Each structure stands twice: as structure tokens, then as C-alpha cells.
């Protein structure tokens, strides 16, 4: 197999990383493993520290959400954690100077997710990401320079569950003006688990046994991003939109299906769209849904991405003129859009590189 390296600018330090991403499960998160090498004649009264700080970038500031300190210096604590197979394998090849380090990401932490900067926005990242750095310092309070330390960026990702869930369906009944029969609208999906790029299908059974006629039917898919810094705020993003000029006659039934596909090829100009965490300027796809234990949000202080397709049924308000009169009957169909379970480490860049 192959490993990853991040050489220090001065050439006196390096860190070895087995793999870039880390799958985060419902209750436990895969531990972060690696080995840091420090050149000889450089550790005399010197100590080595490795951090796993995570912060939400602001622009141009940042706010730390999780920081962990582990000391991999030649002075080793009496209580030594067990070494994984990958760490032990790197010890033999690198040498006896190799100093392994380990990390334990706590559960219920935001995943590596970013947002689209925009047309006039700068190159600074707006989303959240995970960082691994290695440096030498006498103590934590001691200042650490830039050329004397490494800067390795990692991401935390989630994969689609292997257990299919119940089929999503919606029910509604909106009464019209004082005297009218009820309006019944049906909406459902074939399944709730959709892979990235896979088509999405929605089925509609609307039966309008009322005087008011039915205008064009609206089909749209909206992405939810509840970014929280000090207050809870949600955002709207119509990733997919469908136009259907079909109409339903009064006291008549209707039944049709529509097919869509969410992608950012036509959504590049949009601002605030949620995308998967990117280590470099290379673009990624739409952000996957964030699975949660559902016990309690507990102010996760991050970004949670949710998807649900919305059907809008606008009425033409038959009877009087009612040129501007229109009532929107809508329901929400939650669904999950996540990557499937893989068998290899993804390349964090476009596979055919334009260079």
C-alpha cells in the first residue's frame, strides 16, 4: 500500500498519515493514526506536539470547536496507549526515531462540509474543516512559527447506511373558501436513500373535486443548511427545479410522475450552497446528508445538511377574476442523499487532472 507525507518547510520534520478521510459512524468515529518523524540533533531539551484542532473559518477569523493535544516527544508518559497495526508497520520502515501518535474524535461532531464562496468572494474557505499539525515547542504557551511546523488537512465524512428505511409519504388537505369540497394531494418517493448523481422520482396523486381549478404544478428539491455560530439560522437552496404546465380540471383526478437529478453544474453561480469538504481548490459535489443520533442537537456548533423534495400546488382561484389570487398547497418529503459504502480511499481531486 501507500501512505501520505507532509514535509516541513525546513526539512527537519515530517508526518506520515495512513489515510486522508475518516468515516464517522452513528456512535463511534474511526481513530486518527499516524507517525511523526523528527530529525536527530534537533530534540535536545525539545518536545513534539500534534494537534487535531477544528475551526469554522470566517473569512479574510476562526472559532475553535474541538482541540486535542497529544505529546509524541521522546519523553513518553508511563501510561502508553496501544499501537495499531498501521502505526507499528510504519515504525519498522521509518526507524526507531519514529514516534507514533493517536487521536480519538468524540462523537456528535460536525462533519467536514464547506459552502460555495460566490462570484466576487475571495479564495478563503468559508466552511469547516479538520487540521493536523506537528511542531516543536518547549510548552503549549510557546509560540510556533510557520516554517518550523507542518500543516496537514483532513476531512470527516459519512456514508449511506446499509439498512433501507421506510418509504417517505406525505398527506395534506387544504380547505378552500367557506363552501367547497376538500382538496387532497399525494406525494411519495420510491426510496429515501439516494446516491450522489442518481435520479430522483416523485409520484403525485391529486384529486381536486372542487370548483377551483389547478394551475401549473411545481416540483423542486431544496437543501437545508442550519449554520450556527451564536444563533440558530437556516438557509434555503433550490438545487433542482421542475416546470410542469399541466392542469387539473375541476371535479377530476390526476396522476403523474416526475424525475429530477441534483447537481451543481447549473448551480455554480449560486451562493451559500453546501458542498463536501475540499482540501484544495478542486471542486466537489453537493454536501451529503448528516446522519444524527436524533437524541439531542445540543448546539453542535457546525453545519448540518438536510434534503427534502417539495411539491407546490398553486390554485388559480376560479370564480371571481382573481388575477393575482393564488394559494400554494405544499408538502415536504424528507430524503437522504449520501455516498454509498466504498472499497477504496477516494482521491481528493478530479481524477482526470486538467493541470
Amino acid at each position, epitope marked *: 500500500t501507500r501512505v501520505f507525507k507532509k514535509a516541513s518547510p525546513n526539512g527537519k520534520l515530517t508526518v506520515y498519515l495512513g489515510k486522508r478521510d475518516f468515516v464517522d459512524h452513528i456512535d463511534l468515529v474511526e481513530p486518527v493514526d499516524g507517525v511523526v518523524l523528527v530529525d536527530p540533533e534537533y530534540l535536545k531539551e525539545r518536545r513534539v506536539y500534534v494537534t487535531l484542532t477544528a475551526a469554522f473559518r470566517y473569512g479574510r477569523f476562526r472559532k475553535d470547536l474541538f482541540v486535542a493535544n497529544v505529546q509524541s516527544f521522546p519523553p513518553a508518559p508511563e501510561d502508553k496507549k496501544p499501537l495499531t497495526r498501521l502505526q507499528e508497520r510504519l515504525i519498522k520502515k521509518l526507524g526507531e526515531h519514529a514516534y507514533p501518535f493517536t487521536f480519538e474524535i468524540p462523537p456528535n461532531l460536525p462533519s467536514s462540509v464547506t459552502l460555495q464562496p460566490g462570484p466576487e468572494d475571495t479564495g478563503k474557505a468559508i466552511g469547516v474543516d479538520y487540521e493536523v499539525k506537528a511542531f516543536v515547542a518547549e510548552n503549549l504557551e510557546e509560540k510556533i512559527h510557520k516554517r518550523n511546523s507542518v500543516r496537514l488537512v483532513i476531512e470527516k465524512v459519512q456514508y449511506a447506511p446499509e439498512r433501507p428505511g421506510p418509504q417517505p409519504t406525505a398527506e395534506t388537505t387544504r380547505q378552500f373558501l367557506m363552501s367547497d369540497k376538500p382538496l387532497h394531494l399525494e406525494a411519495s418517493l420510491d426510496k429515501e436513500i439516494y446516491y450522489h448523481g442518481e435520479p430522483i422520482s416523485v409520484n403525485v396523486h391529486v384529486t381536486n373535486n372542487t370548483n377551483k381549478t389547478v394551475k401549473k404544478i411545481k416540483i423542486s428539491v431544496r437543501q437545508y443548511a442550519d449554520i450556527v455560530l451564536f444563533n440558530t439560522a437556516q438557509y434555503k437552496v433550490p438545487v433542482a427545479m421542475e416546470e410542469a404546465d399541466d392542469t387539473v380540471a375541476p371535479s377530476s383526478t390526476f396522476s403523474k410522475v416526475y424525475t429530477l437529478t441534483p447537481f451543481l453544474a447549473n448551480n455554480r453561480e449560486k451562493r451559500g450552497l453546501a458542498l463536501d469538504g475540499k482540501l484544495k481548490h478542486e471542486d466537489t459535489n453537493l454536501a451529503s446528508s448528516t446522519l444524527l443520533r436524533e437524541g439531542a442537537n445540543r448546539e453542535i456548533l457546525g453545519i448540518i445538511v438536510s434534503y427534502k423534495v417539495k411539491v407546490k400546488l398553486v390554485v388559480s382561484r376560479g370564480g371571481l377574476l382573481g388575477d393575482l389570487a393564488s394559494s400554494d398547497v405544499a408538502v415536504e418529503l424528507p430524503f437522504t442523499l449520501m455516498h454509498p459504502k466504498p472499497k477504496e480511499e477516494p*482521491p481528493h481531486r478530479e481524477v482526470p487532472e486538467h493541470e
Partner: antibody
Amino acid sequence: VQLVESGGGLVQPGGSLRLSCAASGFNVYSSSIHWVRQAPGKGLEWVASISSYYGYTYYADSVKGRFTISADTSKNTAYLQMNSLRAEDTAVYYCARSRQFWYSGLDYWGQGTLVTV
Amino acid sequence: SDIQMTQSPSSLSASVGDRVTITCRASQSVSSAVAWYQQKPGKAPKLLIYSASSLYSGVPSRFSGSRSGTDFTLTISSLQPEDFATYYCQQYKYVPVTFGQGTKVEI
């Protein structure tokens, strides 16, 4: 899944052909479409590629500018408009398929149609 | 500077079941973006392995691949009669995707 492509035949230099590639069992948004040609008796050669999910479009240097590739998601077909042929451009063209996400090589290949100048 | 990938052995002649080894070098270093393909006369190419270490689905286990530095090798444990075909290299690290020269085995 199985895919079939057709739309080739004997032509003259300076002509224009449109190659249709019917696809079944998969869409174009979740799977990139690539065109690979093979000269008679020579090795394989890549000419163009398309990825509708990101909108990226690439062409080989020898066919840059001449060839335009487009994918129509309505009928789920891959289309390649090729113009201004010379003698050295004759070969057999294969409409292959690759996974847009988690690229793992050209897993699926077309039947292949011969193009003669 | 387009990447040129060449295979030293033009053709291999071997009996049935004997071990056969091949090599396939690259002008520029490629991490793992190497895929192996085989084709028969009057037939479409078929993928054998991807990433030079992984094994595709539906392929016999006798096909094995490995990498060491800049070269890539395809090894066949037992040479079944149906395996007599032509093999090709491929790299997909950059957009100028280039294939190998082409190697053919026969008996």
C-alpha cells in the same frame, strides 16, 4: 448493464458525422462518458470525455476544436459531433463508460463502429 | 509534456498453465491511477484491474497486479486457453489519458 452505439460509415475528407451512443441502466449525471478510438493494428487512443455532473468537457490535442461532445439526459444518450476528417483520423470508435464518482477505470465499453475515410 | 507509457515485451509465447509476467513503465510518476484492459479480435475491451492493486468484479482470481516505484506489472498464475488475448496499459491521473503500446499473447 449493456449499451449500444451506432452512426458510422464510409465518408470523404471534410465530411461530418454524428455518433449516437444509447445508454441503458444508468444516467449521464452519475457516470462520465468517454470515447476511445483504436487505429487498425495500432493501440488504443482517447479523444474526448464528458462529465455532466460538473459540466467539464475535455478533448484530445489531435481532435481539439474539431470535435464537440454533448449528452442529452432526456433520452439518456451520448452524442459526438465530429467534423473535418482526414485520412489519418480513420479508426474504430468505442463509446465506453466510467463512474463519475469513485473513478475506477473504463468498466463498460460499447460494441464499436468502424469509420472509414 | 504528455505522458508516454511503454511496455518492453512486444509479445509473449507460452504454454498452457505456465507463469507469465509482464512489465509496463511510465515516463512520469503516477501514484495509483493505472488500469489494465484486455481485448480479443472482433471484440470490445474489458477491464481487468483498477488502481493496479484492486481486483474488479467478475474477473478470475488468476489475474494479479502490483506496483513498485514507477513501473507496473501484471502477473498471471495459470494461463487458461481463453486468456490468450491482447493486453493494454492505461493511466488516468491527468486528462491526457494515454494507453500502452499493446502486448499480445498467443500459442
